[PDB]
């Protein structure tokens, strides 16, 4: 609903992956409104891809 | 050999490598259209 | 923070963090509870019914139909007879000769 | 989709998301209707989603269609399929400047933007004569065609050149050839070609090979240096880089001359120039038609020094003699001239 | 074979067999025998399930449910549902057919010999948990239950298989017919004692033997375990989300602004902006480097015959006398007549590069016994402030000179529109960066590294003299053969490719090092003579420097020509983005400009502290220079810094587009970035430029 | 979130992979289950050479 | 790179080499100069469509 609940969900996911042994990188991760992000050296931005 | 070598007979060569010739023929008979960039 | 013991086969120190104490700090942790992993697998299987069974069946069929030569498609392999890094084909040949 | 675009339905207008600033081949903005046509032709899902669906009619032969032309109850509003095929005588129409067909009463029936852009290769080796469209072909073909045109009518070109006017550097063939010349160096090329041709004409060293080689470049307006002296070059480069260059002194893959047999080679094609070559042409070998304001006076003299680059030639002063090299093993000695 | 497959079976059967067997994750072509076997099996089971039917009570007039052919996932879920609904054990192997009457799953098979042994071995494989019927080409049948199939079905199947057997031998296909057991030969897998013990001792804490773990996994229901584990987890395990803001971003590595630290030295292999080529116009023929160097020195004879060196600057450790004598030997070898470029006065070469000062390796036992042999601390890179010469390097390498050094071959005629677009882009790119000094420097670099690599072909235990030459072309068309200096490469007795082979390079230059003393703390420079260009005397210095590089570094230098492709790809990405904003290509419009559009302009740099714009050509030249410098100044620090500045730049972009970025551990990113800013000139200048651009963005975002 | 994982391969445990393999192949022939399990157990006893 | 490695420069080029003399002779004697392979000093015709 609001970014506060989104970040609560992100925190819950972080704790869950910690329980499974997966350690998320706080020093190399960031969050932003959906539409622009990266995935395996492939930047996606509102349709454009590089 | 490519200059003064014996001249052999190449009849029926297209048949042996028919797939490549078919690819080339398909390419030659192409009808290119427009080019459209990303949606954004 | 896991369980430290002595292997009774190789006689080497062994560390087992699984089902260990949960972290109290943001530092990296290797203590993965078995129950959480099992529940996650259960959720995945329920969401994708008939997925694990089909994948396992396909893998076992491929293994049945495969051949030893498949092992030769790989990067440098550690040959134990000489204890070095050798090409996959040479390592496989040396292992086969030793087995013979 | 074209029916949507032509119907001017408000939904089609609302179904545009991105910019529609499309350009045509001539570089002129398309008409708004054709802009929407092109945008929706490239973008079909958006309009189909925006239009809205409805229930198909209950008639036996009438059924709907989805975005991917799949029969379904949900059909584009006002669109239906029908198995009752509808059946598919000549007149004269006038034309205007913009290649737009206008009927007798004046309505436009076919515009210049309705031409499908589907490029293809003709199944038959079509031929054209006009030089205005040679630019469509590759650079080597353009060079071959322009040099063939120059050679075939060489008598008329020589006759007009001997008159000394300027109407012979504006032939349609030269305008077609100018396209493959880089814009930045076109002025210098033309200035140098005009200067060398004028120098050749003044003092009779008329060489057929050099004349043919350097005639096409003379079109573009001259671009001289601040000193008022024409530029100097060793080889004139054309578009496409690499092989596409004409050597001013020895010969290039695009242009070569064999005086022993008197054979002209253009882009790998060989021709005979018998009857267009003077006996004394061979004796005046090359040195009088390679630089502007320079003429031959002697032979290789190691004492004067090694060969001088164009940089030193351009800064030279009148009455001073220098040495140049045509090709490997054929050096020559030249002298600057005021004329 | 495949012709028989497509002729003897309906297209549906062939397609079903093909798509069911393609799930094996292997090539379906080179091995079609199993395709024939699977097609025959599919036909057999289809026939078996087409004659008998049931009713509300079980009238025989369906009874057989087909599981094979359908997708493995759907088949498995259907089988599990049937087993659950009928309250019977689920076979571990996917049954090919199920019976409604017997309430049991069944399997079918096809063989070539007697079916009794096949049935018995299948029973041993599956035990007694599944029924089976088996038929053989040689008229043999086997049924676990005699009340399974009727005479009609058995007769039809027998006739079909007999016909197939008869037809196979007509086209010489029965010979190459593989059996059926081969695909399932391995069904026995017994673990040894040692492996069983290793498995038992490799279970998570809380289990004694692997049997307990297996039972726990196969029995326990762990639903709700994640919530229970998360409830008691400490609150301290939190990502600590933090909304990012413009003021949060701060300059990276402020220490580079500390005037106390020394200036960054010039550690590039070859001089880039200070080069000086002894031009020697040539017709265009290809000649050996030794002859080219000899001719170039002959033209500038005064420099060659210089014997008294006027030392101008000296390195901290290098000896000027040794370097000068080595240079004299190199020029003597170049000016001689022997074809080989091999040094004959090895004295000064050996004693100048410190090749005799290497430690001698002794047996490990002595070192263990010895007490004075101790490991040495790592010489961590020093910390240096901003170097002013990197800005000048970037400025000058992006300028347009009077000469070009690129001559690429031709390509076939362009027909497709994409080819035309690519050709136009290539034309614009080359026209823009043909004469750029960066291109000439790149060509010199790649050519020198190629020559260095080639010289290591057979000469490894000998000194080799190599001139730093280049082939260049000017606008007028006349081509020159430039000589930028010499370099003598030493020996590498070890055959390893990652082993440093010391090479000392003497490059000419026209810049007095005293102007920027901090730019050359590692160079030994003399003064050889003076050239005349426009009647004016300009001095010539000889920068002599020792260096060490390995064969892999030679390969890297050779590949350094990839900067051209890199820059072209960057420009093409820019153009593709511009065109993606629209729906049509934006190449000519963004380069030259159309009626609708205007020539795109890019913010290039700063002039007196104010922003300055420029044409797309200048942006392309700057991109090419940046790529070339990145390749030349490349070390682990540079790649790490780039990898982390990627994340920082992406966050800045998200901020620009009003996407409301959030950062969890910002200081972690900043530390990761600053961990790499130690002594690389390129890294330090990149940090400086990043700080400047970040300040500009901050001050420009308030509008 | 463009998340990244620190020490990904220095935290995953071969025992957890063994558990995953056992759970996945819960309905499969015992011999194939053992064959799949032989790899995780071998990794759980890996010895590194320096 | 291919031409440098195989010493198969264009037949109409002015380069000199052991193989280049025969290449030049073949180029002089050949009529279909567009059909000669690149390895024989002919013109390259490769592009995206082919």
Automatic annotation (TrEMBL), chain B:
It comes from the Viruses. It is found in: Host mitochondrion; Virion; Host nucleus. Transmembrane segments: none annotated. Belongs to the influenza viruses PB2 family. Influenza RNA polymerase is composed of three subunits: PB1, PB2 and PA. Interacts (via N-terminus) with PB1 (via C-terminus). Interacts with nucleoprotein NP (via N-terminus). Plays an essential role in transcription initiation and cap-stealing mechanism, in which cellular capped pre-mRNAs are used to generate primers for viral transcription. Recognizes and binds a wide range of cap structures of target pre-RNAs which are subsequently cleaved after 10-13 nucleotides by the viral protein PA. Plays a role in the initiation of the viral genome replication and modulates the activity of the ribonucleoprotein (RNP) complex. This is Polymerase basic protein 2. The gene is PB2. The chain holds residues 101 to 140 of 770 of the full protein.
From TrEMBL, chain E:
Mg(2+) 3 binds at residues 68, 96, 107. The keyword GTP-binding does not apply. Keywords: Cap snatching, Endonuclease, Eukaryotic host gene expression shutoff by virus, Eukaryotic host transcription shutoff by virus, Host cytoplasm, Host gene expression shutoff by virus, Host nucleus, Host-virus interaction, Hydrolase, Inhibition of host RNA polymerase II by virus, Manganese, Metal-binding, Nuclease, Phosphoprotein. GO terms for cellular component: host cell cytoplasm; host cell nucleus. GO terms for molecular function: endonuclease activity; hydrolase activity; metal ion binding; RNA binding. Mg(2+) 1 binds at residues 41, 96, 107-108. It comes from the Viruses. Mn(2+) 1 binds at residues 41, 96, 107-108. Gene3D superfamilies: Influenza RNA-dependent RNA polymerase subunit PA, endonuclease domain. A motif (Nuclear localization signal 1 (NLS1)) lies at residues 112-127. Belongs to the influenza viruses PA family. Influenza RNA polymerase is composed of three subunits: PB1, PB2 and PA. Interacts (via C-terminus) with PB1 (via N-terminus). This is Polymerase acidic protein. It comes from Influenza B virus.
Automatic annotation (TrEMBL), chain F:
Mg(2+) 1 binds at residues 3-4. Mg(2+) 5 binds at residue 4. CTP binds at residues 6-9. Signal peptide: none annotated. Phosphorylated by host PRKCA. Mg(2+) 2 binds at residue 3. Mg(2+) 4 binds at residue 4. Mg(2+) 3 binds at residues 4-5. It is found in: Host nucleus; Host cytoplasm. Belongs to the influenza viruses polymerase PB1 family. RNA-dependent RNA polymerase which is responsible for replication and transcription of virus RNA segments. The transcription of viral mRNAs occurs by a unique mechanism called cap-snatching. 5' methylated caps of cellular mRNAs are cleaved after 10-13 nucleotides by PA. In turn, these short capped RNAs are used as primers by PB1 for transcription of viral mRNAs. During virus replication, PB1 initiates RNA synthesis and copies vRNA into complementary RNA (cRNA) which in turn serves as a template for the production of more vRNAs. Influenza RNA polymerase is composed of three subunits: PB1, PB2 and PA. Interacts (via N-terminus) with PA (via C-terminus). Interacts (via C-terminus) with PB2 (via N-terminus); this interaction is essential for transcription initiation. This is RNA-directed RNA polymerase catalytic subunit.
């Amino acid at each position: 609903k609001d970014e506060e609940t989104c970040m609560e969900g992100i925190n819950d996911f972080y704790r869950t992956c910690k329980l499974l042994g997966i350690n998320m990188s706080k020093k190399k991760s960031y969050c932003n409104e959906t539409g622009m992000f990266e995935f395996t050296s492939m930047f996606y931005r509102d349709g454009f891809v590089s | 050999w490519n200059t003064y070598g014996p001249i052999g007979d190449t009849e029926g060569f297209e048949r042996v490598y028919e797939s490549f010739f078919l690819r080339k023929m398909r390419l030659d008979n192409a009808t290119w259209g427009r080019i459209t960039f990303g949606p954004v | 923070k896991g369980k430290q013991y002595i292997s009774d086969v190789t006689g080497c120190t062994m560390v087992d963090p699984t089902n260990g104490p949960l972290p109290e700090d943001n530092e990296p942790s290797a203590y993965a509870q078995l129950d959480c992993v099992l529940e996650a697998l259960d959720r995945m299987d329920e969401e994708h019914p008939g997925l694990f069974q089909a994948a396992s069946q396909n893998a076992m069929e491929t293994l049945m139909v495969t051949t030893v030569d498949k092992l030769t498609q790989g990067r440098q392999t550690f040959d134990w007879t000489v204890c070095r890094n050798q090409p996959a084909a040479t390592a496989l040949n040396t292992t086969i000769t030793s087995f013979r | 989709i074209l029916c949507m675009v032509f119907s001017q339905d408000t939904r089609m207008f609302q179904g545009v998301r991105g910019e529609i600033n499309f350009l045509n081949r001539a570089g002129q903005l398309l008409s708004p209707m054709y802009q929407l046509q092109r945008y929706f032709l490239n973008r079909s899902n958006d309009l189909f989603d925006q239009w809205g669906y409805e229930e198909s009619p209950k008639a036996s032969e009438l059924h709907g269609i989805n975005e991917s032309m799949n029969a379904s109850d949900y059909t584009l509003k006002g669109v239906v399929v029908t198995r009752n095929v509808i059946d598919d005588e000549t007149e004269k129409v006038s034309i205007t400047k913009n290649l737009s067909l206008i009927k007798r009463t004046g309505e436009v029936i076919m515009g210049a933007n309705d031409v499908s852009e589907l490029e293809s290769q003709a199944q038959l080796m079509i031929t054209y004569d006009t030089p205005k469209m040679w630019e469509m072909g590759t650079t080597k073909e353009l060079v071959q065609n322009t040099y063939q045109w120059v050679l075939k009518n060489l008598v008329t070109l020589k006759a007009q050149f001997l008159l000394g006017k300027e109407d012979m550097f504006q032939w349609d063939a030269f305008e077609a050839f100018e396209s493959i010349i880089p814009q930045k160096m076109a002025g210098q090329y033309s200035g140098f070609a005009r200067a060398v041709l004028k120098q050749m004409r003044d003092q009779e060293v008329m060489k057929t090979d050099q004349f043919i080689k350097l005639l096409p470049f003379c079109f573009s307006p001259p671009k001289l240096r601040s000193n008022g002296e024409p530029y100097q070059f060793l080889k004139l480069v054309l578009k496409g880089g690499g092989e596409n260059f004409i050597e001013v002194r020895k010969g290039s893959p695009l242009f070569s001359y064999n005086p022993q047999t008197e054979v002209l080679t253009i882009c790998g094609r060989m021709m005979s120039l018998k009857g267009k070559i003077e006996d004394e042409e061979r004796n005046r070998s090359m040195g009088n038609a390679v630089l502007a304001g320079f003429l031959v006076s002697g032979k290789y003299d190691p004492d004067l020094g090694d060969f001088k680059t164009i940089e030193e030639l351009e800064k030279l002063k009148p009455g001073e003699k220098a040495n140049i090299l045509l090709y490997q093993g054929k050096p020559v000695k030249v002298v600057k001239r005021k004329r | 074979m495949d012709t028989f497959i497509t002729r003897n079976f309906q297209t549906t059967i062939i397609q079903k067999a093909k798509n069911t067997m393609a799930e094996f994750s292997e090539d379906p072509e080179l091995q079609p025998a199993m395709l024939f076997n699977i097609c025959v099996h599919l036909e057999v089971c289809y026939v078996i399930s087409d004659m008998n039917f049931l009713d509300e009570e079980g009238k025989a007039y369906p009874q057989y449910e087909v599981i094979e052919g359908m997708p493995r996932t759907i088949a498995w879920m259907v089988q599990r549902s049937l087993a659950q609904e009928h309250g019977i054990e689920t076979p571990k192997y996917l049954a090919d057919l199920f019976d409604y009457k017997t309430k049991r799953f069944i399997e079918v098979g096809i063989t070539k010999g007697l079916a009794d042994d096949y049935f018995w071995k299948k029973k041993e494989k599956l035990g007694n948990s599944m029924e089976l019927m088996i038929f053989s080409y040689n008229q043999d049948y086997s049924l676990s239950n005699e009340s399974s199939l009727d005479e009609e079905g058995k007769g039809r199947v027998l006739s079909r298989l007999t016909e197939l057997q008869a037809e196979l031998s007509l086209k010489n296909l029965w010979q190459v017919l593989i059996g059926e057991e081969d695909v399932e030969k391995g069904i026995d897998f017994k673990l040894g004692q040692t492996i069983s013990r290793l498995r038992d001792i490799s279970v998570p804490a809380g289990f004694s033997n692997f049997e307990g773990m297996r039972s726990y996994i196969d029995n326990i229901d762990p639903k709700g375990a994640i919530e229970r584990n998360l409830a008691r987890m400490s609150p301290l395990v939190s990502v600590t989300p933090k909304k990012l803001t413009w003021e949060d971003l701060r300059p990276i590595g402020p220490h580079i602004y500390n005037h106390e630290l020394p200036e960054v030295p010039y550690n590039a292999f070859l001089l880039m902006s200070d080069e000086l080529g002894l031009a020697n116009m040539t017709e265009g023929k290809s000649k050996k480097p030794k002859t080219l160097a000899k001719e170039c020195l002959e033209k500038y004879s005064t420099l060659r015959d210089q014997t008294d060196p006027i030392l101008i600057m000296k390195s901290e450790k290098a000896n000027e006398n040794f370097l000068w004598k080595l240079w004299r030997d190199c020029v003597n070898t170049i000016s001689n007549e022997e074809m080989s470029n091999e040094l004959q006065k090895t004295n000064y070469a050996k004693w100048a590069t410190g090749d005799g000062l290497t430690y001698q390796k002794i047996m490990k036992e002595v070192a263990i016994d010895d007490e004075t042999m101790c490991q040495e601390e790592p010489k961590i890179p020093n910390k240096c402030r901003v170097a002013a010469w990197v800005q000048t390097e970037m400025n000058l390498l992006s300028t347009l000179t009077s000469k070009r050094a690129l001559d690429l071959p031709e390509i076939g005629p362009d027909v497709a529109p994409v080819e035309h677009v690519g050709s136009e882009r290539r034309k614009y790119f080359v026209n823009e960066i043909n004469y750029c000094k960066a291109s000439t420097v790149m060509m010199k670099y790649v050519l020198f590294h190629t020559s260095l690599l080639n010289e290591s072909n057979a000469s490894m235990g000998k000194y080799k003299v190599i001139p730093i030459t280049n082939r260049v072309v000017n606008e007028k068309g006349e081509s020159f053969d430039m000589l930028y200096g010499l370099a003598v490469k030493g020996q590498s007795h070890l055959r390893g490719d990652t082993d440093v082979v010391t090479v000392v390079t003497f490059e000419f230059s026209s810049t007095d090092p005293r102007v920027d003393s901090g730019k050359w703390p590692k160079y030994t420079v003399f003064r050889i003579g003076s050239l005349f260009v426009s009647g004016r005397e300009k001095s010539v210095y000889l920068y002599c420097r020792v260096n060490g590089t390995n064969k892999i570094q030679m390969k890297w230098g050779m590949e350094a020509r990839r900067c051209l492709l890199q820059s072209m790809q960057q420009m093409e990405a820019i153009v593709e983005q511009e065109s993606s904003i629209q729906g049509y290509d934006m190449t000519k419009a963004c380069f030259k400009g159309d009626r609708v559009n205007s020539p795109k302009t890019f913010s290039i740099g700063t002039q007196e502290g104010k922003l300055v714009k420029g044409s797309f050509g200048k942006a392309l030249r700057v991109i090419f220079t940046k790529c070339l410098m990145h390749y030349v100044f490349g070390n682990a620090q540079l790649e790490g810094f780039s990898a982390e500045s990627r994340r920082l730049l992406l966050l800045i972009q998200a901020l620009k587009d009003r996407k409301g970025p959030w950062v969890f551990d910002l200081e972690g990113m900043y530390s990761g970035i600053e961990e790499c800013i130690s002594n690389n000139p390129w890294v330090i200048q990149s940090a400086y430029w990043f700080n400047e651009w970040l300040g500009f963005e901050k001050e420009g975002s308030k509008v | 979130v463009t998340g990244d994982n620190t020490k990904w391969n220095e935290c995953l445990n071969p025992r957890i992979f063994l558990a995953m393999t056992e759970r996945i192949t819960r309905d499969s022939p015992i011999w194939f289950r053992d064959f799949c399990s032989i790899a995780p157990v071998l990794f759980s006893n890996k010895i590194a050479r320096l | 790179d291919y031409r440098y490695t195989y010493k198969c420069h264009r037949g109409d080029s002015k380069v000199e080499g052991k193989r280049m003399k025969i290449i030049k002779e073949l180029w002089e004697n050949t009529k279909g100069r567009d059909g000669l392979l690149v390895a024989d000093g002919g013109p390259n015709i490769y592009n995206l469509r082919n």
